[PDB]
Design a protein around this nucleic acid. Structure first.
Length: 93
DNA sequence: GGGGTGATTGTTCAG
DNA sequence: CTGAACAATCACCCC
């Protein structure tokens, strides 16, 4: 329970850092990237309250393997920023 | 020697 | 604008 699942005002958090790399995207962004268009492309009638919520459920519904593309794309984006972070310190300090 | 924190990321949708 | 559900993350730094 190190990560409380209770609301704590979250959204485009403010700034905090000299260069502030800003970690990396998530397997949900890369996957949601493919879906967003797909999902909504198959349900242009359903709004965010359908495509979104249904996105998450179907997200984990696929399976780790199905995630390989994005999830792996997550480690890819993880390094992407990892560069701006290695410099974040190699420039800020 | 192990812990937990916060910060962030992107979509869609809307008044 | 921005947040809100939806989900993952996980790098960051410490005493």
């Amino acid at each position: 329970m190190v990560t409380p699942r209770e609301p704590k005002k979250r959204t485009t958090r403010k700034k905090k850092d000299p260069n502030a790399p800003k970690r990396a995207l998530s397997a949900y962004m890369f996957f949601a990237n493919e879906n967003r268009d797909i999902v909504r492309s198959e349900n242009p009638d359903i709004t965010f309250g359908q495509v979104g919520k249904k996105l998450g459920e179907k997200w984990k519904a696929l399976t780790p393997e199905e995630k390989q593309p994005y999830e792996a794309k997550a480690q890819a984006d993880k390094k992407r920023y990892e560069s701006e972070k290695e410099l974040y310190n190699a420039t800020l300090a």
